[PDB]
Amino acid sequence: NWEIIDIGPFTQNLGKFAVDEANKIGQYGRLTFNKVIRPCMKKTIYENEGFREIKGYEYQLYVYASDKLFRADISEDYKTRGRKLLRFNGPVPPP
Numbered sequence: 001n002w003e004i005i006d007i008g009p010f011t012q013n014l015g016k017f018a019v020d021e022a023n024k025i026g027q028y029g030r031l032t033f034n035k036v037i038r039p040c041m042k043k044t045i046y047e048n049e050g051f052r053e054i055k056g057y058e059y060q061l062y063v064y065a066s067d068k069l070f071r072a073d074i075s076e077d078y079k080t081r082g083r084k085l086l087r088f089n090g091p092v093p094p095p
Helices: 011-024
Strands: 001-005 033-046 053-064 068-077 080-091
Touching: 011 033, 011 053, 011 068, 033 068
Parallel strands: none
Antiparallel strands: 001 033, 033 053, 053 068, 068 080
8 A cells, every 4th residue: 555656746746735834834944845856655545444445645755945855744635635744854864
C-alpha cells in the first residue's frame, strides 16, 4: 500500500500545497517553495468494508523551501477532494 511516485507536476503541486499550508501556520516564517525532491512516498488508504474502495491517499514528501529541506505529510480524500497538511517539519538533512 506504499509506493514511490515520481516528481512531475502533480507531486510538485503537493509540495506547493504543503508550503502554502506551512506558511499559514508560520512556525518557520514565510517560506518560498523551491522543489520537491526524491524519494516521494504515496500510501493508498482503503475503506474498511468495501472491496478495493480507495478512500484516499497519504504522501510523505521532502520539499525545499527558502533553500531549507522540510518533511511534509499530506492526506487527500476522494469524495471531497480535500487536502490536509498532516505534518510539516525541519529543516532536515537530505535523504
